[PDB]
Design a protein around this ligand. Structure first.
Ligand SMILES: *C/C=C(C)/C=C/C=C(C)/C=C/C1=C(C)CCCC1(C)C
Length: 133
């Protein structure tokens, strides 16, 4: 399925620290963030996505249209400009953020009743799993 609609709660988060270091997020932000349960809420209508990731701490809103290149300024992440593009490879949703960091982006797919999110930067891969609330 390409339907990723839902309120998804984080079950697991592997190597978030390595990914965040590859991004140059400061040590203290990394230390808080690694401990936090995330909730990802995806509103998907055709090609249009509206995403909100929420935690007790900081939140990140990301909206995009599949197949439509978009500028991003990653404020209160690593504060960089990237050229982002989200497309489908079969039922994997693939984001590539072109810019200063090598191999930036994330692969979003679907397996059984879970959402899998694989965040990449440089040589680092962070693997997250979410279940519907
Ligand atoms: C498809 C959903 C995506 C790509 C969600 C991405 C969320 C982030 C890149 C946010 C990461 C965060 C940190 C690295 C530090 C704490 C703040 C967060 C949780 C927004």
């Amino acid at each position: 399925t390409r339907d990723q609609n839902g309120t998804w709660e984080m079950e697991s988060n592997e190597n978030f620290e390595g990914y965040m270091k590859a991004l140059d997020i400061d040590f203290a932000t990394r230390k808080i963030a690694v401990r936090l349960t995330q909730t990802l809420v995806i509103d998907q209508d055709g090609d249009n996505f509206k995403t909100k990731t929420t935690s007790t701490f900081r939140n990140y809103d990301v909206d995009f249209t599949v197949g439509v290149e978009f500028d991003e300024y990653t404020k209160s992440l690593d504060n960089r400009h990237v050229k982002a593009l989200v497309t489908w490879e079969g039922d994997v949703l693939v984001c590539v953020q072109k810019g200063e960091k090598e191999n930036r982006g994330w692969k979003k797919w679907i397996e059984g009743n879970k959402l899998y999110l694989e965040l990449t930067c440089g040589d680092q891969v962070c693997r997250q799993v979410f279940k519907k609330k």
